[PDB]
From Swiss-Prot:
The gene is IL36RN. It comes from the Eukaryota. InterPro entries: IL-1_CS, IL-1_fam, IL-1RA/IL-36, IL1/FGF. It comes from Homo sapiens. This is Interleukin-36 receptor antagonist protein. It is found in: Cytoplasm; Secreted.
Amino acid sequence: LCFRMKDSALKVLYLHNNQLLAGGLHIKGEEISVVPNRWPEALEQGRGSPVILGVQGGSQCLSCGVGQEPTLTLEPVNIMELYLGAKESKSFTFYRRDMGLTSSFESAAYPGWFLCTVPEADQPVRLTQELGKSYNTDFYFQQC
């Protein structure tokens, strides 16, 4: 079972050039796998429910990388390997906070950094520490 996502400005999340973009208003959206980290106790759960985000049937997953500064990339690892503990998952883990209508996603590997979109159409989804400003950190789900 998968989800489709939009930012709170209703821009659809979809794939182009192996990047998640937000736009498609000029489109159902990429079917996103949202999978609970199966070892939750080892994480910071007051921040939200830890999940791994996948695309294309969970055959690629979103990572914040392992550098000093996070950056958002789709990596060719199946969510199964990340879920089964056959690959380290923390850079792939986000804390999902549910506000009712929308959810936000905070990097577990890089605290304070949130999944976000920019106002301009059809740009990459990225990460930000800045809340309440121009970057949109709130997302809608639609079930598939």
